[PDB]
Amino acid sequence: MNIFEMLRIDEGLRLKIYKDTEGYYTIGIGHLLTKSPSLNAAKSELDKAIGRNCNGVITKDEAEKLFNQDVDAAVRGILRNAKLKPVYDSLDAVRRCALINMVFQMGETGVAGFTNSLRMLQQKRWDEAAVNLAKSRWYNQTPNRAKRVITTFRTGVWDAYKNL
């Protein structure tokens, strides 16, 4: 299992513009287009993102291209972030994937706000950090996905995704 397979389990694949758990306009493999309520603003972002007139619909191909860019940006964002970098460097390969997953879903900023959990992950206090991560809007709003990520940080193995 790898980061791409992991995120693809969590995000799914949709070739037509759709709404987030959050009600936001998205397409592909969790590629948020706009936080704006107009389908029209979303369509415009889409064509800008793809470089063609898409009319709200993309190919598998285009979806994976956006996915490659998004993953790349997430990692680079982690590497550029003063708060995130040190945690990332301290982690093993599997747990590194769990932090990437969080950044992809919630952005650099959002994750950098989990101050106490970050501190615990750096210290390698797995059970403590898992308990603290669960105390969040994140967990309450998308419990099945949060719990997969959390188990991943807890165990350091890919079992939560074995099932799926």
Cα distances (Å, whole numbers) of residue 122 to 16, 75, 87, 91, 118: 40, 18, 5, 7, 6
CATH topology of domain 1-164: Lysozyme (1.10.530)
Annotated binding-site positions for substrate:
32, 104, 117, 132
Domain boundaries, the chain: 1-164
- The answer to whether 75 and 100 have CB atoms below 8 angstroms apart is yes
Annotated binding-site positions:
32, 104, 117, 132
How many angstroms separate the CA atoms of 35 and 20, rounded? Answer: 10
Helix-helix angle 143-155:126-133, to 10 degrees: 170
Resolution in Å equals 1.7
User: Which are the catalytic amino acids?
Assistant: 11, 20
